[model samples]
Target: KELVLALYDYQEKSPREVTMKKGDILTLLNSTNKDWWKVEVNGRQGFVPAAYVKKLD
Candidate 1:
């Protein structure tokens, strides 16, 4: 399952609206690398910290 990168001190508030949570299947808008990617979930478009997301290998 994919997990949302919650707003935390480590992360900056994105200009994109909406926040994601568990069960949100973000559409992969752009891939940063084999691990990182840019996605939009719940109307929020930003880069999701790959380390926080569960990869479906």
Candidate 2:
């Protein structure tokens, strides 16, 4: 269960996107995408830019 922390707030541009608030903790789904990473929050799934998040690695 790889998780990530959102460093900034982002709004979904479309249905395929996810909304992220600052300090949001999200579950990383797929990272194969170039910049957009799939994530899950509150059982909701959507895509967000990889740069917008930080991993606890």
Candidate 3:
């Protein structure tokens, strides 16, 4: 299991969107590095910094 984390604060920038809310569950599709991960949530896909996700045991 994995958890989603907010990369940036809400309403902090233009065209900003968040498919997964804070503390939401997300699926890890792929990652190029330990500091980044591509995630899918609610059918929306986006790359999230690894620092923002926590993997479960």
Candidate 4:
């Protein structure tokens, strides 16, 4: 159970994706891959670009 920060403004291209704005804090769900990682914002869970999110420390 870890938290992450959104690096840029993003828009979901499909339902499997989640949109997040820059400076938004989100919860990390699954990060077992390198391309896309699952996260949640406002209880909405979906995948976002891997590079767009980073660890807190």
Best by TM-score: 4
TM-score, per-candidate, Cα-based: 0.49, 0.90, 0.58, 0.92
lDDT of 4 by residue, 1-57 (tens): 689999998899988999999999999999998989999998789999999998774
- C-alpha lDDT of candidate 1 relative to the true structure: 0.52
| Per-candidate clashes, comma-separated | 0, 0, 0, 0
Model 2, position 30, has a per-residue lDDT of 89
Candidate 2 residues 1-57, lDDT tens each? Answer: 589999999999988999999899999998988899999978789999999998865
Which digits, one per residue and each the tens of the lDDT, describe model 3 over residues 1-57?
Answer: 355555443221222223445576777777567865667777766666666666653
Off-target runs (Cα >4 Å) in candidate 1 are 1-18, 55-57
lDDT of each: 0.52, 0.90, 0.57, 0.91
- Considering summed lDDT, which 10 consecutive residues are worst modelled in model 3? 9-18
Deviation of model 1 at 8, angstroms: 13
- The residue pairs that clash in candidate 4, if any, are none
